Amino acid sequence: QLFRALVSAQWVAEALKAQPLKLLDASWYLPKLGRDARREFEERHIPGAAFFDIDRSSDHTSPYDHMLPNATHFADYAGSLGVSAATHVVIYDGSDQGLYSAPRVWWMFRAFGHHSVSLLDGGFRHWLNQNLPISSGKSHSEPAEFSAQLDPSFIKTHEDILENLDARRFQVVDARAAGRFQGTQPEPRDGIEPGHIPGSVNIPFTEFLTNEGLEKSPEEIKRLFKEKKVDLSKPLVATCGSGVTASHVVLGAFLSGKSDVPVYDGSWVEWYMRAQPEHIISEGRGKT
Ligand SMILES: NC(=O)c1ccsc1NC(=O)CSc1nc2ccccc2c(=O)[nH]1
Ligand code: NA
Ligand code: NA
Ligand code: NA
């Protein structure tokens, strides 16, 4: 029914030695982490990989963060990294969590009509742990022909989130850390304060991942949604800070057989900026 979302390190390592495969490092870190993803790629990466810069695949005209680009922009960029319609794209990142920003890129390719895409389970962390082969040097690829076309069903807008406060057609699940959702930990963006969307439920993205940074099983993921009173038989929308880690909610749903979980791309940054005071639920004190 669905093209597989996960591939293993061992399957990738074997495939390297043997529908072309394109490995993409989509690492991206918030400034306060003090890490530079592209610099790290140049030092060490999976052999043959290219670096997918999520800042080259976003709408910089927006005041909000990590917003989808238009289809032409995406297509041009994917093609420049050597992706074609026949390609099996496998995305990874080098996060401490295992996967962090890579699931956004999996979701983006699918939203743009490219369904033969997967994530490297455990990311570069696991790859390194296993002492698998690595390469260095700046990113490069020959170009390929790529077309894209956005399926709007992959997205919810601010207007949709606001209407749903009353209509209650879909469940909203927020992948931010618990303290950000509750209002007790800061938002990384200056001018944005923490808290959550009324009626939403928190499943921090780390809840989908084991202690080794691998994805939990579909069985454990279904249990996790059920315990949080999230019903995979009803409509579900994923949100987070800027629409990136929300994709872990989409992924865990997809692995559970529910492949139609849109992302609220605007996410908390947009919600906060466009809010009236009643729209911010927080243990913290509302802005004066
Ligand atoms: N360039 C940026 O988006 C940026 C720079 C400083 S703060 C920031 N972005 C944000 O604070 C958006 S909220 C946010 N974005 C993320 C992006 C990638 C991965 C995780 C997150 C997150 O938890 N929250
Ligand atoms: Na976004
Ligand atoms: Na580079
Ligand atoms: Na802030």
Residue numbers in the entry: 5 to 22, 27 to 296
Give sentences from the paper.
Interestingly, 1–3 all have a similar structural scaffold, i.e., an aromatic ring-carbonyl-S-pyrimidone structure. Persulfurated C248 appears to interact with the 4-pyrimidone-like aromatic ring of both compounds. To our knowledge, this interaction is novel in terms of both the long distance (>3.45 Å) and the orientation of the persulfide bond (almost perpendicular to the aromatic ring of the inhibitors). Direct hydrogen bonding by R188 and S250 and water-mediated hydrogen bonding by E195 and R197 are commonly observed with compounds 1 and 3. In addition, compound 1 forms water-mediated hydrogen bonds with D63 and H74. Both compounds were in van der Waals contact with W36, L38, P39, D73, H74, Y108, R188, P196, R197, G249, S250, V252 and V277. The thiophene ring (compound 1) and naphthalene ring (compound 3) exhibit cation-π interaction with R197 and parallel stacking interaction with the salt bridge between D73 and R19726. Gas-phase calculations indicated that the interaction of S–S− with pyrimidone is strongly exothermic (10.4 kcal/mol; CCSD(T)/aug-cc-pVDZ), which is not inconsistent with the experimental ITC measurements (ΔH = −9.37 and −11.76 kcal/mol for compounds 1 and 3, respectively). We concluded that the interaction is predominantly due to electrostatic attraction between the persulfur anion and the positively charged carbonyl carbon of the pyrimidone structure. Compound 1 showed about 25% inhibition of recombinant CBS and CSE enzymatic activities, while compound 3 was almost inactive towards CBS and CSE.
